[PDB]
Amino acid sequence: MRGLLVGAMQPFHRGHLQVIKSILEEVDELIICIGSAQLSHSIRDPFTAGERVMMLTKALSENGIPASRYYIIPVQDIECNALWVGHIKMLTPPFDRVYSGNPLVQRLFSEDGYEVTAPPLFYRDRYSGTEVRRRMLDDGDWRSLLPESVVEVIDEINGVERIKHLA
Template sequence: MNGNRGLLIGRMQPVHKGHINVIKDTLEEVDELIIGIGSADKSHTNSNPFTGGERILMLTKALRESNIDPSRYYIIPLEDISCNSLWVGHVKMLTPPFNKVYSGNSLVQQLFEEENIKVIQPPLFNRTEYSGTEVRKRILNNTNWEELVPPAVVKVINEIKGTQRIHKLNQKEISELI
């Protein structure tokens, strides 16, 4: 490693074991990692039920629980902006300098590549199970969601009554369709 700093962006709705595995793997390639909480301004919807602050809390506690050295990462909330062509500049303004980006999102990859920033697609860990969509679906169905997230995240979700929120948001969306 030669003093390099990477940027990893994810919505983390919620933080799950796949995120922690990707962060651990990425930290093997970089000296420091900026973890961008994407769509930090979005919350209380079916696809984005948790606030940026709640996701930062989940991630901070999960990384501590995994014994990941806090001097090696920064957690930065990244709000969406309505103009994609300006988004990379927006991200650069909010983060420490970085020389590579880790993202599995094709739009994020495209936007950074257009700015001549190296993009690496991180390996996905058991993507069928370790996805925010799967965690939220299992919460709605009251089935084994806890096995997909670190214990610290289970505690945060319970503390903020996250399962009740997801159920209420789903009811709200159904009633809007009727």
């Protein structure tokens, strides 16, 4: 039993961690796709795929989740939404269930014939990439939205410095 979760992870926050631990209670393995693997240095997608890979690795590792229970696979976006499901399948191990709270993602897999489920959201007004990125820019409390290990990576790559400069 393998599940599939896809997210920009810009950056990886507590919302992601919480939902990932939750899904891991009903699937043997979870394929975690890092979307928009080609985008970086924008207000929407500030970090590279490589950097986001380090965030998921540190965070999940620090939380005791065995590395063999998941797959971190970067997936570049594509112009055709009609070929996106195929794009994912082409780059990943087989999977039986899709977990997503994203309308487009849910609909594209739903139409292809996959069972998709939308997990309960955890503090959806605080745990979202949009809010995190906004706090980083306007000096709000963003550290409280991310696992300590992600905060460490963000400091090592000078993420706040970059995002603020670009703005």
